[PDB]
């Protein structure tokens, strides 16, 4: 089940919004100073909800996506990344690193703890 979250955002805002979001359920949620600190962290703690914002950049830490990836830890993990353009072939992109899904930032109450809620619950098809 859900044990630790992690967010990464630009606004101060959204840092804010989405950490009482979760806060408030109950779950441990807490944000970083950059997608870099707080990917590269999320290897060494391995958080169960990761999520990362930025525009195409160029420097290090997205890459760590790809060594989570390949193992069976974190592959299983979902991981949602946040997007600006809204194009297609960033798409491509988010899925190539290795992570789950992705969307549009800002992000809503009710979307972001239904996105966690239904990982939280059992399955039972």
């Known amino acids: 089940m859900i044990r630790t ?8 805002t959204m840092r804010a919004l989405l950490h009482a979001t979760l806060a408030q359920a109950g779950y441990e949620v807490t944000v970083a100073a950059d997608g870099e600190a707080g990917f590269d962290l999320a290897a060494t703690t391995a958080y ?3 999520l990362t914002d930025q525009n ?8 760590l996506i790809a060594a989570l990836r390949q193992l069976s830890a974190y592959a299983d993990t979902p991981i949602l990344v946040l997007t600006t353009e809204g194009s297609d072939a960033f798409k491509a992109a988010a899925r190539d690193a290795g992570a789950t899904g992705w969307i549009e930032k800002p992000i809503d109450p009710g979307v972001l703890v239904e996105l966690v809620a239904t990982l939280s619950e059992p399955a039972a098809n």
Request: charged fraction near 30%; hydrophobic fraction near 45%.
């Open 5 to 12: 979250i992690l967010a990464i955002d630009d606004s101060a």
């Open 48 to 50: 169960d909800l990761v």
């Open 56 to 63: 195409m950049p160029r420097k290090s830490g997205l890459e």
